[PDB]
Every structure is written in structure tokens, then in C-alpha cells.
Design a binder for this molecule. Structure first.
Ligand SMILES: CCCCC/C=C/C/C=C/C/C=C\C/C=C\CCCC(=O)O[C@H](COC(=O)CCCCCCCCCCCCCCCCC)COP(=O)(O)O[C@@H]1[C@H](O)[C@H](O)[C@@H](OP(=O)(O)O)[C@H](OP(=O)(O)O)[C@H]1O
Ligand SMILES: CCCCC/C=C/C/C=C/C/C=C\C/C=C\CCCC(=O)O[C@H](COC(=O)CCCCCCCCCCCCCCCCC)COP(=O)(O)O[C@@H]1[C@H](O)[C@H](O)[C@@H](OP(=O)(O)O)[C@H](OP(=O)(O)O)[C@H]1O
Ligand SMILES: [Ca+2]
Ligand SMILES: [Ca+2]
Ligand SMILES: [Ca+2]
Ligand SMILES: [Ca+2]
Ligand SMILES: [Ca+2]
Ligand SMILES: [Ca+2]
Ligand SMILES: [Ca+2]
Ligand SMILES: [Ca+2]
Lengths: 331, 144, 331, 144, 331, 331, 144, 144
């Protein structure tokens, strides 16, 4: 029925402000629950949020359970999710598994905590933040763009890690016994030097461990430069990959839009051409002009579909060539 | 020539259910429902939007006779139609197979009659091979 | 009149050193007022700037009020700003609204402070820095380039925020009770761990909060790497977008320059061709050569307009193809 | 041939207000103002800059007769003119509509006479349809 | 023999999960040995790892010696490594030299330490991490991409170093005598200012040295901005270079795949055409249909090889041009 | 004479290892003098370098004075530097001005210090580092690439500076009276908040000033993220610009190489064609074959010049199009 | 026509070692080994995969006679073959040298007979120069 | 034919200062210096490198008669020469001016005789306009 289809459209694959409002509202409520989880352990407003995180929690649990059982009821629309095995393979999806896990765990914690309820509920309140992005439209993009450039990322991480290991060992060798101004020794072990290396290479630079001897500072400077410049590489690669992948998806969407127009145009043109043969005459007086009307409509829609270029001004690489070829064909 | 224009004007008045030279979009939808082709939407709205040069919704044949006057075989339409076939053809392929043509013709847009699909396949493809050039198809379509 | 047009050109949409001097001067004066606002609270030169920030303020207020009322007088040139409703919709613009707000607030503060005048004037002295860039030529570029890549920025911020939340929670769990060297506990609450996460992920690394237990350092290292590399993404995307958008604007400007040349060329060529018919003979002796002169001038201007390529050497992607097509057409 | 060159030299001397073979840019501007076509600027400066091969400002017909000698129908000018029409035409469109042509002709550059615009539209567009090919226009323009 | 070839394929130039498992296992064992080297100097679990790093070390030494002598036995397959001089030039390779050095040094240290064994073994345990990537498929990419952009990297490093020198000298001049809050002086010498400059320019910012006087802070801010933005350049250049170089290598690989298909197609087509002449008749009855079968197979393989485009959707820059040229050729 | 030309080639516009050695040597000597300047103020090896920095300084001064007067003698080769006014305009160059300034200042300091010599010589020892890159091949590239993208850099710096101002003012407003753990107040004035803003926005993060109140931390986090991502933009823009500009220069160089080949080919072909007319016969027997020999040589050189593509594999965007056009022309 | 089809069916039954109309991939491999051309692999598997329209492994001549019916000179094959020669030719070169052609023909794919290579070189290259156009080669190959 | 080859072999032996069939690069340089065309470098080295098919430095006419056999009018040379003219021509320009042609011919590569430059300009450019098409120039150059 149309009801199941409209519900499935409203719950999965949302589009329009009518669904944007609902999703933004549920996300804002999840974030407000999380902010209530932050203030529940500050030890200065603990009594203000140690009790409301039970009523709010059970309200959210009932809401999400209803949402889950309703989105389950919409599995009849999908061609592969029909039947009991179809509902089972729908529940086999990872996001639905996460939703079910959150639901049952919240229910169990609410049941046991009232028979320290916050002690376990915080990690669930974290996991509720993940069910906000439906259809997994975020992780697939990242997975694809990381898998495409799977060789540049590996080599840059390998070079960075090798530099980290070697340079941090040399620093530890040069500072194995040296006392700071506060009276303690910083590079006590080799793991402490590794910690210094991981803090320097990523350019965090806390300031708990700083080399002291003049032979330590030279290696620290060389490592900082020549390995910050190598650990900072994944930013550009992943960025260009993201942009290119989104452009490819947009082009594929536009081209999938173009097809129905062409189909309607071909079909309507053939219907208009075969005006010879499909009181049976007065009806035939208007079928011709109606076919002409829908043919004009189809030509309009097709011209409106092939008109856009999607970045729009991308024809500058073949501007003069195309007009030259066209005028050559004219002759 | 003029007799056809007068007969078409009379038919438009009959579809408008009145002797006035009005498009009568609602009367046009009623006549379409009477023709079995129930529009089920406001398709007549966009139709008139394209058929009413002035966009009046109902005018004394503003471009109806002019709509007829569109040759429908002019190069400005054969080019568009040939571009429409290009969507289904690989690089310099043409010759789109009768199977693929029937598939896209019946399973996309609005489905046509299956016998009409077979008739179109027979008309375009005469050699019988799995190669029906789009150029010959558009040539016969805009021929007459 | 030409006066109103010249004034509008000098005040909005400036061009040339004659207007560059004026705008640079007003901006330098605003910046000098701001630097006087900095030294007015250093508590060691306070008496030097606590009084001059009244006379300088009223001088700047009178100057900007005059500039506002003069730029208002130039609304007659604009086709949409004619009439009283036209002046109203001109004042409806956001930058003009900011200018009016600054003017009236400075006037009110000057009136009330002389009947602690610096206490409120500083935020106005901040807002004066915003009225320097006219026509909003800065915010529109940023808005457009952010809206174009509205999907890559959202996904990278979402992934970064999720990593921040989860990793900072795990760090707080691993350091909930551990005392630093100074005798206090760092990760007192979960908000403190969130602060550590926001300082580490963006690679600021102040050094007020550092993990202590060996299970904290591992998570800190993994988070630092794998989330710095994800929060550092907007740099590349926005940069490529800015470059591309400025190139598109430059091309559109050049193409809008090209049109008047072609129009003049077509018109002058047609005028030269129809030399048959527009003492009425001696005048006709020179109209022909004058038409030839202006035709040569038009050909010169048109060749000078289509000559540039704006990045200039962009024809290398179609160098041989174009000459091949040309020689093919020759045959 | 030679008679036309001599008559043009005499006319140039008359416009120069002197028998000397000088361009006389100021005298040329005065003669243009007398012709009703008030230049109102130093357009004659750039004109001579293009008309004076040596850039002397006034020379004994350095390229005036040579300026005439420019065929004005040579392919090196028809190519430029055809490129000038390309600015107003879509991809492989040509056939720019009489309405758009009149619009760009009167509202851009320097406006021509409205009747001259209609005459040009009638001369270029003979079939009467909204399709005036740029090739035919440039062909007649550089024909004679 | 096939044995030597299969062994060489399994040891050098690995492909498939069957070799992936072996290489991942040896790398995991090397990393576990390294982690045992970390805990061997923490002074709180030293006795737990001070003795096992002898038995594990000799086990790893025997394993790697066997692997070395086995991969040496596979030099007969290579056309240039046949003969004793061939084995010598195989051992001339740098990675094999590193492997031999590690082997002999581990053997010598194991022999001498049992006649403080950890004191020297750690640097070897570091060098074992380098023999993991065979064929040097990592360093060649980096070398090539650095050598390509050898002029942008030099100029950016030169500008950054010049700014570092000049600005750090000015900072030292402005802070040569100023005491911090803890009672000591920070910029004691000019080398200390150089250390501050190298920590600021690379945006590490430890916090051991901070300028104090108002003339120091201005120079520090200007240097930080205008030289961080210049030292951060190698990230983008090397990233784009890496992506482009990997794309070039992939295209070269695909094109080298394409050739055998075309060769087989040409050969099989010529064999099918010359069906006239190569009880000698019954055999000729089936050679024709077998040649037709292998010809169809060759056409299938060739179409399957020229089908891929490897980034896949790269034809959008020449989409309409190619079909236009094709239909022009049709006429 | 050839001597002056060879000298000018060896001193300016160097090429080859023969000049590379000399320039690398002079740069290494300058750097060693600078390293002697570093150790001359460490107050623990001061007596070791307080005296040698006079003899080494006068040696370097004499060397550079000789180099200057010799490179001055080579102004006769340049077409514009001939004559006394030519030598004057040669000395008008900025790098020569810097060299003359360094020379005269070193001479004056050496003369006065021997009649505290290190007190002034250090800034000169800095400026000697600048005369190493001849022809100004470094600053012109940077100038050009900054001037090309002069609109993206301005807008990103403007947005970053506006965010800095506003957010640092809000932070100062939220922390105007709050004491740290050490008993002092951090944000004493508004300039101190500006210092915090410039340290946070550029992601240095020293750790001398950290916000304390819960309303300060929120603004600090928002500013850090949303303004680090805007101040980090010049890296990508300048990087892409550098790469593109170097590619353009390389292409221009290759095309300027191509011309002599074509000229020689045309000239030699015309000489070979006009073999009819330039004991005067025996000489004509060999001129023909010698002309054929040099013609073959010219064809070889021309094919060798048009062969390279300089990034080499750049024809993939027009691979099939060119062969299609060629075979179309064949028909 | 029909006699050739019947003879080919009889030969296929003989190779199948049975009167049944089956492909008999194993019997086909045995017959190939008997023909001296030992396949040494499951090449017959892929062969039937391309030769069995229904992929049954053994069918009553599903496309065997249809396989014959493939003209083998159709433009859809000459285009592919001409594209195969393009791999060895430089930009607009063609005319690939007899030396290079012999080299690639004998040292790549499966090696042909050396005398067959020389015969092909002589057939394609008649002028004797180091220039054998690929167009003439494909033209004679798909000629008869 | 054969007489020309024998005379060229005799001339090569005379230039080699010996009856042996040797290239004699040093003797070739000496003969060039005797011809007034002092090479002043080891140009003969590269010349033989291109003229000695086997690179022996001196061989019994390895490709000397074959060097002659190069038609010098073959399309594989006219294409290269036409590409050489393309360096000096704008997009689809051709018609490079006699002034520019003389300039590039005398001020680049090795300078030719000024009268030879004028003769080439007169031979290529016959219409007298500032337009000498490169196609006609290469056509006459490779004509005979
Ligand atoms: C911490 C604090 C940090 C910063 C502090 C506070 C933030 C806010 C500061 C104030 C921002 C105001 C920006 C206003 C810019 C502005 O005026 O442009 C907005 C669009 O803005 C965006 O794209 C919107 C972009 C928003 C991006 C937000 C980032 C309106 O532009 P519009 O889209 O309405 O179009 C204009 C508009 O109609 C003008 O009235 C019209 O003027 P005339 O030239 O006189 O006709 C223009 O005609 P032309 O086409 O002939 O030029 C139009 O092109
Ligand atoms: C903290 C401290 C940090 C750094 C410390 C201080 C900063 C300043 C240090 C000193 C900078 C000096 C750079 C001077 C570079 C230089 O000499 O080039 C400038 C342009 O410079 C820019 O683009 C200007 C680029 C400015 C970029 C500023 C950044 C003048 O170059 P130009 O545009 O005048 O053209 C030259 C010039 O006429 C030469 O005299 C001429 O020499 P010849 O070769 O002998 O004929 C050249 O002829 P060619 O075309 O045949 O080669 C010309 O191409
Ligand atoms: Ca009606
Ligand atoms: Ca109407
Ligand atoms: Ca005069
Ligand atoms: Ca003159
Ligand atoms: Ca069977
Ligand atoms: Ca079967
Ligand atoms: Ca000899
Ligand atoms: Ca030889």
C-alpha cells in the first residue's frame, strides 16, 4: 500500500524539510541527553542530573523502540525484505543491529537499575549518536576513498613510523641520564622516548618531555621537520579523493536522471508518428492533438534534462573543438 | 489546409464543451478521461504551459494551429531525437540490439503496447541481425 | 547627473589608486583606533588612552555619519533604489544596517558617557572593522565554496566528532583516578576529558592535561593520529574550491568583456557594407573612409579582446588537436 | 582606380583644411564634428594609431590608399567576423533569432538605426523563420 | 625447475593471500620482538624480558638465516643472477646487504653475550623492521616524487630557513636579558633562540621557551604565521605527486596487460584466415572449428582487456567529441 | 673575448658540477662561519670563537671582495651592461647592492674593531646567507605565485583575522578576573587575550595562557576549530601554484629548445633542394652528399627534440581522439 | 550450405565419441590431444563457455552452426582487429616494420611457425619497404 | 643509376684519401676543411653515427648508397618538414610573413646567404602578399 511506501520513505532515505525536521529533532534530543550525561559527573551538579537520566532515558528508550518496530513494519516494500526471512535479513543490517542492541541494553539497564544506573548508561548514550546517519551514507564514502588510495597511505604511514622508531631511539640514547629543572628524569625508559616521538611527530607538542642535551635537540629538530612533513600527508590525498568521489556520484545521479526523459521522448515520438491506426472517428479527432501536446511536453522535459552541465563551467577544455567539429560536419 | 485548421478548431471547441475559443484545461482533462486516457494529474497544466504561447490558460488558439505548423520533421527535432537515442548507445556503437531496445521501451518511461514494441522492432530492424542503427530509425520516424 | 554616478563609483565598487588611497586610509584609521583600544586596558598606559578615546571616537563618528549620509544620497543612480522605497530597500542591505547600527550606538554612547565610556565602546570599535570590505565581496565567496562542498565537510566533521567523543570517553575511563606530579587530579570529570580531546584533536596541545596511565597513552596516540588526519581535511577542500571559484569568476569577467567588441564589429561591418545609401555628395565623400577607419578600429579592438587566454598556457590539452582540425578543414 | 585614389587624396586634403598631405587628427575631428558625428573624445588618436603605419600622426598618405587596398572581403576578415557572431550563438546553434539579433544590435555597442536593424534582419533572414544562419550573413556582408 | 620459480615468487614479489599470510606473520613476529625490547628497559618488568630476549633472539636469527640462504638458492631463475658472479651481484643488492648484516651481527652478539646482551641487540631489533618491505617498493616511490618536485621543495625550505634565521635572531636580540616567572632566563644564548625558532616554525610549541617583552611577542606572532604557512608546503606537493605517480604506474600496468591479448588476437586471426593449407583429411575437419573456437576466445579476452578504463569515469572530458568524430567518420 | 663569457657563465647562471662545487663550497663556508657565530655567545665556549671570528671574517671579506670585483669585470658580455653607465646599472641590481653593502660593512667593522667586534658582525654574517642564490631564482617564483592568487590569500587572512579579533575579545571578557593554579592571573589585559588568540589560531599552543571558566573553554574550542581550518589555507593554494608554475616554466624551456632544430631543418632542407646552382665541378661532386649528411643530421636532431613530452604520460586525455583524427585524415 | 552443416554435425559427434548431439568438453580435449594440440589445461571449459549459448556444457548444437554463421568478416570484428594492431603502432604511424611485426608475432602470445611469420610478412608487405600498413593487413585478413 | 653509385663511391674514396671503402671521419673533416666549410668540431662524428648503420666509423658503404636511396620526398619526411614550419605559425595561421620568414631564416640556426633568403622568399611567395602558405613551400621543397 501507499502507506508503507510513504513510511519507508520518511524513515529511511529521507528527503525534504518534512523529514529533515524529524531527523534534526531526534538528533538534537540525543545530543541533549549526552549533554545531560556530561553534567552528571561534574560532582558539582551531580544531584541535578543523577535522577532525570532515568525518566529521560526510559522516554528515549520507548521512543526508539517504537521507531524500530515501525521501521521494521515497512520491510514489505523492499523486494528482498518480503517474508519472514526478508525481515530477518533486514535486521541483519549493521545499523539495525546497533539499534536493536541499544534498545535491549537500555531496557535491561533500566530494569536492573531500579530493582549506579548512570554507571553503565553513558556508553549507550554514546552509541545512540551513531544511529543518526541512516543508510550509512558516511562510512561508505570514507571506505571507498581510503581503499582507492590504499598504496599512498600505506607508504606514508610506513615511512613516518620508521622515522619515529629510529629517531626516538636515538633521542633516548642521547638523553638516557639527564635531569630536568624540576629534579626528575624525563626519558626514563624507551617507552617514554616513544611517547615523546608520537607527541612530536604529530605536532601536538604537549611539553611534558623535552630533550635537554645538545645532541638531543639536533635530532629532535631534524625529526620534527622531516617527519611532520610525512605524517601530514593523508590530509591532501583524502581531501582530493573526497572531492572527486562526490563529483563522480553527482554525475552518475544526473545521468540516471537523464534516462526517463529520453525513454518518454522516444516512446511519444513513435506514438505520434504512427498516427495512421492504433462512431470511432470523433475520438480520433483529438487523439492526434493530445499526442502532439504530450510530445511537445516530452521535448521540453528532455531539453530541460540535458541542459545542465552537472563545476558548471567545465566545457572550457573543449569549447572551440566542439564548435569546429560541428561546423565541419555542417559542410 | 484551411479545412483541417477549421476542423481542428471545431474539435477543440467540442473538447472545451463550449463554442468559445478557449483551451479549457479542465474540460481538456475531462475529455482525456472520456478518451480512456485518464491523466490522473494536472498534466494538462504543463501541456498548456507549453501549448499556450501567452500562458493565458485559455486563448483563441494562440499557438494551436502554430503547434500543428511545427513540421515535427525539422532538423531541430531530428537532432534532439538522435541525441535521445545516444543515451542507450555505447561509444560509436549505434546498432542497439532489438532485445535492449524492447527492454528499454517497455520497462521505462511509460510502457507501450507489446505488439507495438514488436512492430517498431520489425520496422526499424529489417536485416534481422542484432544491429538496428539509430540513424535509420530516426530517418523513418521523421520521414513522414 | 554625472556627479551622483562618480560619487557612487568612489564609495561603492571602488577601482583605481584614487579610491584605494581613501579606503586604505579609512582602514588604517580604524586599525589605529583599535590599537588605541588595546592600550587603554593595559593598566600601565591607561591614563594615556582613557581620554583620547572620546575625542577620537566622536571625530570618527562624525566622519562615518557623513560618509553614510553621502553614500545614501547616491541611491538615485541605481535603477532599483530610486524613490523613498528605493532608499529604504538600500538601507535594508546588511552592511548598511551594520553601518547605521555602529553610527547610532557610537552617538548614544558618546552622549551618555559625558552626561566608563570605554567600557562599551570597545565592541563597537570591533564592529567598525567589518564595514571596511564593501559589496560583501568576501563572505559571498566563502559561502559559495562552503555550500558547493557541503557533503565532504559534513562527513569529515561528523567522523572527527565521533572519534573525539568515543576516544575522549575511553581516556576518561582510563584516567578517572590518577594524580599528576603537582598533586592534583587532571581528568576530574568527563567534561575535562572532552576538553583534552578538543585540545588534542585540533593539534593545539596546550599541556594542562596529559594522560598518565599506560592505557591512557595508547588511546591518546591512536586518537591523535587517526583524528588529526581527519579534522585537518577542510584545508585542502576549501583551498581547491577557492582557487577554482576565482578562476571561474575571472573567466566570466573576460567573456563579459568580449561581447561589446563583437557587437561593435558586427554593427560597424554592416554599416560599412551598406555604403550604397544611408549638396548631399561632398559629405558622402568622407563618410566611407570614416566608416573604414572605425571598422579597422573595431577589428583591432576585437582582436585585442579575443587575444588573451584568461593559467595563460591552458591550450596544451588541445594544442595539436585544434591545428589538426583546422588543416583538415582546409582540405 | 587612380582617379579614385586622387579624389580620396583631395578629400583628405580638404578634411585637413590644407593642401599638405597630412592626417591632421585635430582637423579630422573638426571635420567629423562638421559631419554631425561629433567624436566627443580622442577617437581620432587611436584611429590614426591604426591608420598611420609609421605612427607619425600626419604623413603623406602612409597607408591611407593601403587602407583602401585592404580588400575587406579577405578571408582574414571573414574569419574574424564569423568568430564575432560565435559569441552570441550556442553550441552549434547558429541561426540566431531575429529577436535576439535585433536586441543585441540595438542595446549593445553603439545603437544603430531601428529601421536599419529591421533592414538587416530582412536582408539576412529571408525564409522568415526564427533561424538566420551566421554563415549566410557573413557571406553577404563580405560578398560585395 | 618449477620449484625454484615458485620459491622465488613466494619470497620476492609476493602476491595472493598465501604469501600475504607469511609476510604478515613474519612482520608481526618482528613487531612482537620489538615490543619485548620496549618492556626490557622499563625497570619495572626488566627481569621478565631480560632473559627471553636471548632465546627469542636466537630463534629469530636461525629463522632469518634459513630464509636468507633459501632466497639465495632461488637466484638461478633470474637471467642476470645465474652463476657465482650472479649470486654475488644478487647479494650486492642493498636489502640483501641489510639482511646479511643483521644476520651476522645477531649471530656475533649471541655468541659474545653468552661467553648486557640486550645493550647492543636493540639497534638490530630496529633494523629488522626494515627488511619487511621487499623489492624496495616504498623508497623508490618517495625518491621519484621528491626528485620530480626538486625545485619547489628546495625553494620552500630555503625561504623557511631564512625566515627562521632572521626572525630568531631578532627575537634573541629583543629578549637577551629578561627573567621568566620561575626565576631563570630563557634566551640565554643565540642557540636557545634558534631552538625556539625551530619549535615555533614547525608549530610544535612545547612551551619551555616563550618570549616575554612586548617587542618579542610581535616578532613571534609574525614569524609564526608567515613561516608556518611556508614550512607546511611539502605536504600538498608530495601528496599530489604521490597520487599522480600511483595513477601513472597503474595505467602502465594496465597497458602492459593489454599487449598479450592483441598478440593472441592477431596470431589467431591469421591462423584462421590461412585455413587453405598449414589420411590427412579427417584431421582437417576439426582444425577449422577449433581455430574458430580459439579465435572467439581471443576476441572475448581482448574485449575484456580493452574494456576497463583504469578514476574510472575519466571519459567526461572527451565524451561528446568522440561520438561526434565517430558519426562524422560514418558519413 | 671567450674568457669574459666563460667567467660570467661560471659566476652568474651556473650550470654543471664544475660550478656546483664552487657554489656549494662557498655556501658551506658561509654556514660554517654562521655556526662559529652561534658558539661565540654560548658563554661556555666563548673564548674559543671570540678571536677566530676576526681572522676568518677578514679572510671571507677579502674572498668576497675579490669575487665581487671579478664578477664586475664580466659586465662587458651583457648587451645592456657595456660602458660605465652599464656597469652602474649592473651595480644597480639588488643582489649586487646587498653584496656591496656586506663587503663595505665587513671592511668597516674589521677596521674599527681592531683600532666587541662580534657585537655587530653577527647581523652581517646573517646577510651573507642571502647572496648564495644568484639570479634571484627563488624570490621571483614566490612573488609570482602569491600575486596570482592575490584574492584567495587576502580573503582567508581577512576571515582568520576577524575571527581572531572577535573570539579573543570574547575570551578576554569571559576571563577578565580568574586566577590560575600558580596564584597569578593570566588574561590581565586585552593584549594578553590577543596573544592567546594568535598562539591558538596558528595551532602553536604554548601553554602559558589557558582559559579557566567554563564559558571560556567553549569559545576557545569553537575558535580553535573554525579558525585553525581557515588560517591553514595558504598551504594548499601556494603549493598547487608552485607546482603549476614550475610546470609552465619547464614547458616554456622545452619549447624554446624546439626552435633551433626547426630552423636548422628548414634551412638545410632548402639548401638540399637548391642543388642546381649555389675546375668548379669536382668540388660540386661532394657538396651534394655533404648537404644530404647534414640534412639527415638535422632530421635526427629535430625528431630528438620533438620526441619528449615535457608528467610525461600526459597524452591520455587526447589519446584516442588524435588517432581517430589522423585516420580520418587518411581517408 | 546444409551439407556443410550436416558434415560439421557428424564431425562434432565423432569428436564427442558418441552419436548424441553433445559438446562433450572432455571428449573435445581428448580429440585435441589426439590432434597433437594437447590443451594441457581446461581451455575447453572457457571455449564452451563462449561456444555454449545456454552454458549447458553439452547441447544439441546450441550455437555451433551459429558460431559458423558469424561472418568473421563483419565490421564488428574488423574494427576489433584494427584496434588490436593499434597497440603496436605509434601515433598515426601505422606501417609497423616487418622486423617489429615478426618480433611481436613470434615472441609474444603463442609463437607461430617461423616460416608462417615470413609468409605473413611477405603477404602483408609487398612494396618491400619497412612500412606495412595495418589497414591493408586487416583488409586482406577479413577479405576472404 | 649504377654509374651514379660508382661515381659516388669513387668520390668517397677520394675524400677518404685512399682506395679503401672506408668512411674515414678524419679524412672527411679534412676534405670539409678543404671545401672551405671548416667543421671546427667533431660534427663528422655524429654525421657518421647517423650515416654508419653499423656504427663502425668506417665501412664499405654500409648505408651511403642507402642514404642516397632515401627518397627525401617520402611522406615520412614531408610530414616532419611540415611540422617544422608549424613552430613559427599561429593557430591555423600558416601564411607566415616574408618578413618573419626571412628574420627566422637568417637570425637563427646557421645563417644562410641573404640573397638565398630573398630567392627563397620569391620562390615560395608568388602572389606578393604577406601570406606564404607553408603547404606550398613544403610541396615545392619535396616536389623535385
Ligand atoms: C566570529 C565571527 C565571525 C564573522 C562575523 C559575523 C558573520 C557575518 C557577517 C556579515 C555578513 C554579511 C554578508 C553579506 C554579503 C552580501 O551582501 O551578499 C549577500 C549574499 O551573501 C552570502 O552569500 C552569504 C554568505 C554567508 C557566509 C557566512 C560565513 C546578498 O547577495 P544577493 O544574493 O542578495 O545578491 C546581491 C544583492 O541583491 C544586492 O543587493 C545587489 O546589489 P547591486 O549590485 O546594487 O544590484 C547585487 O547585484 P549585482 O548582481 O549587480 O552585484 C546582488 O548580486
Ligand atoms: C624576514 C625576512 C625574510 C626575507 C628577507 C628579505 C626579503 C628580500 C630579499 C631580497 C629580495 C630580492 C629579490 C630580487 C629578485 C630579482 O632580481 O628579480 C626581480 C623581480 O623580483 C620579484 O619578482 C620580486 C619578488 C618579491 C618577493 C618578496 C617575498 C627583478 O626582475 P625583473 O622583473 O626586473 O627582470 C629581470 C631584470 O631586468 C634583470 O636585470 C635581467 O637580467 P639579465 O638576465 O642580465 O638580462 C633579467 O633578464 P632575463 O629575462 O634575460 O633573465 C630580467 O628578467
Ligand atoms: Ca471554453
Ligand atoms: Ca492561452
Ligand atoms: Ca594638414
Ligand atoms: Ca603618419
Ligand atoms: Ca556426447
Ligand atoms: Ca550447451
Ligand atoms: Ca679510408
Ligand atoms: Ca661503418
Amino acid at each position: 500500500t501507499h502507506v508503507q511506501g510513504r513510511v519507508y520513505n520518511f524513515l529511511e532515505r529521507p528527503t525534504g524539510w518534512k523529514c529533515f525536521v524529524y531527523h534534526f529533532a531526534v538528533f538534537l534530543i540525543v545530543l541533549v541527553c549526552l549533554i545531560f550525561s556530561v553534567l552528571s559527573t561534574i560532582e558539582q551538579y551531580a544531584a541535578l542530573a543523577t535522577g532525570t537520566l532515568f525518566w529521560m532515558e526510559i522516554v528515549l528508550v520507548v521512543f526508539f523502540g517504537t521507531e524500530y518496530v515501525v521501521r521494521l513494519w515497512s520491510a514489505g516494500c523492499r523486494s528482498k525484505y518480503v517474508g519472514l526471512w526478508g525481515r530477518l535479513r533486514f535486521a541483519r543490517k549493521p545499523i539495525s543491529i546497533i539499534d536493536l542492541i541499544v534498545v535491549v541494553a537500555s531496557m535491561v539497564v533500566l530494569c536492573v537499575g531500579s530493582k549506579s544506573a548512570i554507571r553503565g548508561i553513558r556508553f549507550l548514550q554514546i552509541l545512540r549518536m551513531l544511529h543518526v546517519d541512516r543508510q550509512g551514507g558516511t562510512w561508505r564514502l570514507l571506505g571507498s576513498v581510503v581503499f582507492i588510495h590504499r598504496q599512498e597511505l600505506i607508504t606514508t604511514l610506513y615511512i613516518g613510523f620508521l622515522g619515529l622508531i629510529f629517531s626516538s631511539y636515538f633521542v633516548y640514547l642521547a638523553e638516557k641520564d639527564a635531569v630536568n629543572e624540576s629534579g626528575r628524569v624525563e626519558f626514563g625508559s624507551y617507552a617514554d622516548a616513544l611517547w615523546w616521538g608520537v607527541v612530536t611527530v604529530t605536532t601536538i607538542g604537549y611539553g611534558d618531555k623535552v630533550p635537554q642535551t645538545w645532541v638531543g635537540k639536533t635530532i629532535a629538530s631534524c625529526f620534527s621537520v622531516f617527519a611532520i612533513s610525512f605524517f601530514a600527508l593523508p590530509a591532501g590525498i583524502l581531501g582530493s579523493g573526497f572531492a572527486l568521489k562526490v563529483q563522480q556520484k553527482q554525475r552518475q545521479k544526473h545521468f540516471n536522471r537523464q534516462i526517463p526523459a529520453a525513454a518518454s521522448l522516444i516512446q511519444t515520438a513513435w506514438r505520434c508518428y504512427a498516427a495512421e491506426n492504433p462512431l470511432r472517428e470523433h475520438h480520433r479527432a483529438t487523439i492526434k492533438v493530445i499526442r502532439r501536446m504530450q510530445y511537445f511536453v516530452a521535448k521540453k522535459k528532455f531539453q530541460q534534462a540535458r541542459k545542465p552541465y552537472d563545476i558548471e563551467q567545465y566545457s572550457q577544455g573543449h569549447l572551440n573543438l566542439m564548435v569546429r567539429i560541428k561546423e565541419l560536419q555542417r559542410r | 489546409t484551411e479545412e483541417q485548421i477549421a476542423e481542428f478548431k471545431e474539435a477543440f471547441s467540442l473538447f472545451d464543451k463550449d463554442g468559445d475559443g478557449t483551451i479549457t484545461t479542465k474540460e481538456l482533462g475531462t475529455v482525456m478521461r472520456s478518451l480512456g486516457q485518464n491523466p490522473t494529474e494536472a498534466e494538462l497544466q504543463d501541456m498548456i504551459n507549453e501549448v499556450d504561447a501567452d500562458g493565458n490558460g485559455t486563448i483563441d488558439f494562440p499557438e494551436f494551429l502554430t503547434m500543428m505548423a511545427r513540421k515535427m520533421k525539422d532538423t531541430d527535432s531530428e537532432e534532439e531525437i538522435r541525441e535521445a537515442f545516444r543515451v542507450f548507445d555505447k561509444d560509436g556503437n549505434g546498432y542497439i540490439s532489438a532485445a535492449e531496445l524492447r527492454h528499454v521501451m517497455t520497462n521505462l518511461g511509460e510502457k507501450l503496447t507489446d505488439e507495438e514494441v514488436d512492430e517498431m522492432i520489425r520496422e526499424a530492424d529489417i536485416d534481422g541481425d542484432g544491429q538496428v542503427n539509430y540513424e535509420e530509425f530516426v530517418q523513418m520516424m521523421t520521414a513522414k
